[PDB]
């Protein structure tokens, strides 16, 4: 298990144009297009994200493309930002593959109302930071994948995800 068969798990892979939890459009494994609820707006963002005409459908190799930058695109983000360089560090590698996969989902500023469970992560008080993230509006819109990562940050294992 690594960062991309994580996230795979936890996003699927759509080759066409469909909404996401929040009524989104978004494509292939995860992409959000855009927050726009037109369907045009949606297409043309598609079509200037692959540099082609693409009618709303994409191929598995334009998806995983989209996803290998959105992946690298995350990670850059966080050691940019200046609050999540140090929770990231202070990291183990299996617990740094759970804190992507909450920056890929929410965006580092979703992200930001993490504050105090930040702080936890950073301190290593895993069973307490398990608690503090589980109230939050993420866990209970999205449950069953809050659990699997929490749960990945708890343990520092791969078991939620086997
Ligand atoms: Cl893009
Ligand atoms: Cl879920």
Redesign the pocket.
């Known amino acids: 298990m690594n960062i991309f068969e994580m996230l795979r798990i936890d996003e699927g892979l759509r080759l066409k144009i469909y909404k996401d939890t929040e009524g989104y459009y978004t494509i292939g494994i995860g992409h959000l297009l855009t927050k726009s609820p037109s369907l045009n707006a949606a297409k043309s963002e598609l079509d200037k994200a692959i540099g082609r005409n693409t009618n709303g459908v994409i191929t598995k190799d334009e998806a995983e493309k989209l996803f290998n930058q959105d992946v690298d695109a995350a990670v850059r983000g966080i050691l940019r930002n200046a609050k999540l360089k140090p929770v990231y560090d202070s990291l183990d590698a299996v617990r740094r593959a759970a804190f992507i996969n909450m920056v890929f989902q929410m965006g580092e500023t979703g992200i930001a109302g993490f504050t105090n469970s930040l702080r936890m992560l950073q301190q290593k008080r895993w069973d307490e930071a398990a608690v503090n993230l589980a109230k939050s509006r993420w866990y209970n819109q999205?449950?069953?994948?809050?659990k699997r990562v929490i749960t990945t940050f708890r343990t520092g294992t791969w078991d939620a995800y086997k």
């Not at 999205?142 to 809050?146: D, G, H, Y």
């Open positions: 999205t449950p069953n994948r809050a």
